[PDB]
Amino acid sequence: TNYSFRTLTLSTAEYTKVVEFLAREAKVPRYTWVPTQVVSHILPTEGLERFLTAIKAGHDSVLFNANGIYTMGDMIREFEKHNDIFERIGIDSSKLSKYYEAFLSFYRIQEAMKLPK
Amino acid sequence: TNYSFRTLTLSTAEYTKVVEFLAREAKVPRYTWVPTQVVSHILPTEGLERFLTAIKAGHDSVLFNANGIYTMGDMIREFEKHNDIFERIGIDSSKLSKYYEAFLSFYRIQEAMKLPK
């Protein structure tokens, strides 16, 4: 289609292993394709404005505003409830991949902070 | 929870990265809790006996036989269809976590075999 998502089954032990693994990848810059270093620098408490800015999504952010996504937890919640939030709100498909890539790393970091290990 | 399953959403690119990541961990010995190092050496074509032997599950294997699970692919396929296979057959809960840990890591390796990047 473009960028399909697959729901994998993650057991409690493997779950924390994967979540923390990707969190480290997102925390410490290791991606040149997508600036994750700035993404992990963003506090999810501000919203998603900085997240969009990180990928230069100054116009795509409007889609979030339309859906009521401009707060903390909402973006993650929408991801857990749907995951295809960006596709649903009307995000540009030409950059859909880049958006979803950064979004995934963000979720991992967020969960890793709550991860008991 | 012990070894409960949580649905995680994996992006196409992240999916292969995660699948291969766990396969690497389960391949090269890095755990003392679960003998995954020998598990990655096990041919899932012999059945599940070798897998049970790895963790010294010479008694729990009976539960599999009871359910009719003693063939190749059957255990993994049953995991896909049920996921609570070991729980259903009557695996000992005191070792249930370890069984599932090796089980999950094994599936990751198996899938990684067909996994490109």
> In chain A, what are the domains?
1-117 (1.10.150.830)
* Separation CA A101–CA B10 (nearest Å): 10
Tokens read off for B43: 């041919």
The residue whose two tokens read 């075999």 is B113
CB B22 within 8 A of CB B108: yes
* Selected residues 5-64 of chain B with any CB under 8 Å from a CB in chain A: 5-15, 17-19, 21-22, 25
* Separation CA A18–CA A13 (nearest Å): 9
Tokens read off for B26: 């389960």
**B113 class by beta-carbon count within 10 Å (0-12 exposed, 13-18 middle, 19+ buried):** exposed
The residue whose two tokens read 């996921």 is B83
Cβ distance of B105 and A4 shorter than 8 Å:
no
CA quadruple A33, A35, A40, A46: dihedral sign: negative
Q: Which amino acid is at B97?
A: S
Q: Which amino acid is at B31?
A: Y
For residue B5, the surrounding DSSP H or E stretch is strand B5-11
The long-range contacts involving A64-70, CB below 8 angstroms and separated by at least 24 positions, are A64/A89, A66/A90
CB A115 within 8 A of CB A75: no
Cβ distance of B9 and A97 shorter than 8 Å:
no
Smallest CA–CA distance, residue B6 to chain A, in Å, is 5
Beta-bridged to residue B11, according to DSSP, are: A5
The DSSP string of B58-109 is: TTTHHHHHHHT--STTHHHHHHHHTS-HHHHHT--HHHHHHHHHHHHHHHHH
If one counts every other C-beta atom within 10 angstroms of the C-beta of residue B114, the result is 7
> What residue ranges in chain A does DSSP mark as E strands?
5-11
Q: Pick from A6, A12, A21: which is nearest to B21 by CB?
A: A21
* Separation CA B77–CA B107 (nearest Å): 10
The residues, ordered by sequence, that sit 6+ positions from A60 with a Cβ below 8 Å of its Cβ are A52, A86, A91, A92, A95, A99
The phi, psi pair for B70, rounded to 5°, reads -150, 15
Q: Report chain A residues whose CB lies below 8 A from the CB of B22.
A: 14, 17-18
In the Cβ-directed half-sphere of B72, how many Cα atoms lie within 13 Å? Answer: 7
Q: Which amino acid is at A44?
A: P
The experimental technique used to determine this model is NMR
